From a paper:
In this study, we identified and characterized mercuric reductase (GbsMerA), which is coded as a component of the mercury resistance (mer) operon in G. salicanalis isolated from Antarctic soil. GbsMerA has two pathways that connect molecular surfaces to the si- and re-faces of the isoalloxazine ring in FAD.
Furthermore, we determined the GbsMerA–NADPH complex structure. Residues at the NADPH-binding site are conserved, similar to those found in other MerAs, and generate positively charged surfaces. Structural comparison between the FAD- and FAD–NADPH-bound forms indicated that these residues were not changed upon NADPH binding, except for Tyr174 and Arg195. Arg195, which is located at the edge of the central sheet of the NAPDH domain, was tilted toward the solvent area in the NADPH complex. However, in the NADPH complex, the side chain of Tyr174 was flipped opposite to the isoalloxazine ring of FAD by 6.5 Å (OH group). The Tyr174 residue was replaced with the nicotinamide ring of NADPH. Mutation of Tyr174 to Phe showed decreased activity by 50%, indicating that the interaction of Tyr174 with the isoalloxazine ring of FAD through the hydroxyl group of tyrosine may be important for controlling the NADPH binding.
Residue numbers in the entry:
A (entry chain A), B (entry chain A): 2 to 448
Write the structure that this text describes.
Amino acid sequence: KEYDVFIIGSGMAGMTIANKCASKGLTVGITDELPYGGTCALRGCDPKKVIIGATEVRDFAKRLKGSGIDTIPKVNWKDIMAFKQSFVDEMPPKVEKGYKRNGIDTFHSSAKFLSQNTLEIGNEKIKAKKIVIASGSKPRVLEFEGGHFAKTSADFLNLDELPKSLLFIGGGYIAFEFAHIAARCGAEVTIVHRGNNPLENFEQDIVKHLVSATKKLGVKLILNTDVTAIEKADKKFRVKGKSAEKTEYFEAEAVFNSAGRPPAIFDLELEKAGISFTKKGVSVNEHLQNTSNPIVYAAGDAADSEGLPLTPVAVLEGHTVASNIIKGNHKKISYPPMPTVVFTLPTMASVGYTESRARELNYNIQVNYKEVGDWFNAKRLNVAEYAFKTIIDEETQTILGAHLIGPHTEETINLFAMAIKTKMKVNDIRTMIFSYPTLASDIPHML
Amino acid sequence: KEYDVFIIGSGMAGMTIANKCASKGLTVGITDELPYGGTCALRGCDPKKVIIGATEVRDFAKRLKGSGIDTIPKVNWKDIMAFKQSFVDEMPPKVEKGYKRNGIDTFHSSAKFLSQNTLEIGNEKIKAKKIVIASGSKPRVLEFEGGHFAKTSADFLNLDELPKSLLFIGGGYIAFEFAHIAARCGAEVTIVHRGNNPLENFEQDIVKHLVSATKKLGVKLILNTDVTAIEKADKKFRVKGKSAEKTEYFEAEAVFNSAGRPPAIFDLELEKAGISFTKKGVSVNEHLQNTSNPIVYAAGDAADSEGLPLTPVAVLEGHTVASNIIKGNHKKISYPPMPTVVFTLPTMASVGYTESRARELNYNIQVNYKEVGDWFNAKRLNVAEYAFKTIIDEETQTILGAHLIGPHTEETINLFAMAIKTKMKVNDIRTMIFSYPTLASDIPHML
Ligand SMILES: Cc1cc2nc3c(=O)[nH]c(=O)nc-3n(C[C@H](O)[C@H](O)[C@H](O)COP(=O)(O)OP(=O)(O)OC[C@H]3O[C@@H](n4cnc5c(N)ncnc54)[C@H](O)[C@@H]3O)c2cc1C
Ligand SMILES: Cc1cc2nc3c(=O)[nH]c(=O)nc-3n(C[C@H](O)[C@H](O)[C@H](O)COP(=O)(O)OP(=O)(O)OC[C@H]3O[C@@H](n4cnc5c(N)ncnc54)[C@H](O)[C@@H]3O)c2cc1C
Ligand SMILES: NC(=O)C1=CN([C@@H]2O[C@H](COP(=O)(O)OP(=O)(O)OC[C@H]3O[C@@H](n4cnc5c(N)ncnc54)[C@H](OP(=O)(O)O)[C@@H]3O)[C@@H](O)[C@H]2O)C=CC1
Ligand SMILES: NC(=O)C1=CN([C@@H]2O[C@H](COP(=O)(O)OP(=O)(O)OC[C@H]3O[C@@H](n4cnc5c(N)ncnc54)[C@H](OP(=O)(O)O)[C@@H]3O)[C@@H](O)[C@H]2O)C=CC1
């Protein structure tokens, strides 16, 4: 079998490129070793956010207790899992039906290269004129003793019962979001992180408020401790934590792998196709084309790209690859502001540069950082943690970055994104009119 | 007593101008016939939004019932009133303390003009070089029989107990927002509106979904019926409704005046100062200066201005008046997009032009209207009503307006505001990156 385009993975990147390429009369083939839809839809952003919803109900009631609410609901684990599970189950049929409907050849096996332009799909041989690697990323294989007793983000999202005690290895997005969920549903939770700081790429002047919020929730955070072993006891697990000071041991029903997500490229036999790759994924140029094999493109978490491993980024990288495969190399990938969020309660969000990174680019900057728990918006919702840090280019009076924790920040952060992209002057923002009363109306006050 | 500036009203407009003028070394005087802070802070946006908060808790629980929540909280009227009351009581001391601190002379009586440049404050005579009318607006005096049994928006916001049955006269913002509150707290509610359409200045293709949402909530909406009398029965009120077809009578514990808000200018003896006014408020030029008396300025709901009677508008009108009083007439008032919201659940929001108004300006337009109750964002929150209408200038591929109902619309509408003001191209918006999963991420899909 010979195609114009063969795609590895039908997550956000792979789908985006299948549908677009098919639409311009190319012959399209695509395999996923798992149900079609990718990580976000099946085992990431979407199943998570559904579940977070039921926690939002408890937290909001807990917050106005005695101020007009007299009962704080317990979350019904089964019911919300079941509700989550419905969005999950309905996704693959939808996608497949879209493929058969667009004239896209569909496969359901793991893929290895046999040569430059040729693929072993399950127990078949397949060839193409252009190949795309959109296989995303996968839980880190924990190399040390007991490593394999680490359950995944995906396992977490599938649990029939919430354990009595959880422990997350690695203090990033997942550990914190899943700790909030787990804690709000009535489980003890521990996060063990080898760094001196959690959530290391966020503005620590902001992070500390979430760390505060997290601990008030009863969650244990251990810093400066590397996890080096797991041992299964009677209906328990026992975890080794190594610091400079000591080795300590932690007991919990259930241990989870939060330790970051390497690209899903290491079982692909890329060497057999003369395809250049680092440990951050497939190596790409301005056209998202591989640097040795000129017939290969990549997009999403699998791509060693200047873009953040996020759902909207996999799509934008999709469109450049799709377009360059279709018309030849003509379009260079261009990244706008890449807003990011930690779906804790309260949510934290960031866009553009941190202080530290703004200084590294030798910008003369203004910083505005303030803790504003006393502002009407935080006060009326009884959310204790509300703080912001903005970074203004002093010379052009345009925004370079903004980092927020508090109510609706996952929404509000997009206005800062729009602001950065449109190169809006700080004064045009100050004299602009918002709906009130809203969180958006606090922006003029952050400068 | 002789001042550089005397201000009538310390709501948003009056405050804004006091503080700014004082700050540039002018002598400032200011009276409010009520506690300092204005309608928004004391008897409008702020006390309302606090209360709406406790309803958000019930509605969100009601929405995920059986999907992970097993109890729908009753709202504790006293407790939330008491909570509301705290924000209300803390406002005037804050403002006064700001005045004494800025060197602002403070008065607490109703104001009438005695002449061109002269004011009767309580039982005093006062003169100024520039005078500002920032007296906002006031419930309509209901002229007909029983008119005076109509309780106010303000009375509503102050109730010790929620009645068993409410009836609102006039189907605008207040009737709908207060009906939602009242209904969610367990009272029967009726809205009586003389028009064929409710919420007449909104896009009716959107309004109808809120009308749908409102009726599913058990609220009675009567159209094409003018209210012509009220009669107090035994622990009851009985209301006359006149249509073409008939006269019908409605019984309720409590009747409220939702019938629109004339400017608070008609008891000011403006004639005695040769001050030009229509029934929409004090007549103003580009400088927000009166058109006969050249020493007078106005700002906010009291001003017959091209701006919407809203908290953020009173502020922007403040700054032009303040600035022109300070440096002389030099600055013309300029209005950006004026986002507006109906704090029902679900919220509805609008910005820029309706279809009908876009056509009136002879724009070649594209319209995108869709009901999207099936979108992930509505589905995961179980909000039945999610719909949008956008209006694109066909020629410049920039937005002219957008009208939304659904989750976080009061927030999302500001992105459309930013979009209109920054004259962002529809494609730059489509290829821009949002945080996901968020309501903001549905914008590219509305075009
Ligand atoms: C728990 C979790 C939460 C997240 N939350 C968010 C969030 O809130 N917001 C956000 O923006 N991003 C979030 N992300 C990141 C987001 O999921 C990714 O950035 C996005 O899925 C990238 O799309 P992709 O197409 O590159 O990869 P994917 O969507 O994962 O698609 C790749 C596909 O390749 C398949 N595949 C892998 N290896 C092979 C192989 N050898 N053979 C065949 N098929 C293969 C996979 O099964 C998968 O279906 C989250 C990730 C996780 C794990
Ligand atoms: C129930 C309600 C809800 C609202 N919700 C919103 C909302 O959610 N968002 C929004 O943007 N807008 C909202 N508004 C409108 C908003 O309140 C006004 O646009 C805003 O208050 C205008 O400010 P202003 O300074 O012109 O008037 P005000 O803020 O009312 O200030 C005028 C002041 O003048 C005083 N005064 C009046 N007459 C006299 C007199 N003769 N002598 C002395 N003092 C006098 C008044 O007591 C008052 O303190 C709402 C209004 C109401 C009634
Ligand atoms: N809202 C969103 O946008 C979300 C996005 N995601 C996506 O998922 C991925 C995030 O993965 P996540 O699991 O949070 O990991 P992160 O990379 O965010 O952080 C994990 C941390 O774990 C530490 N760690 C590694 N090994 C150990 C160990 N043995 N003991 C203790 N700590 C250890 C690492 O330290 P070190 O760095 O020093 O090696 C690292 O800092 C990204 O692709 C992200 O885009 C995840 C959820 C939410
Ligand atoms: N979220 C926000 O921004 C909010 C803003 N506000 C502010 O408050 C004001 C809105 O006042 P509101 O009370 O909602 O009034 P609106 O002007 O919005 O609408 C009231 C309606 O009542 C009708 N009406 C008048 N008399 C009768 C009668 N006898 N019987 C039946 N219907 C009648 C009127 O019909 P007709 O027009 O045909 O004469 C009118 O359409 C504005 O200043 C607004 O800015 C209010 C609350 C929320």
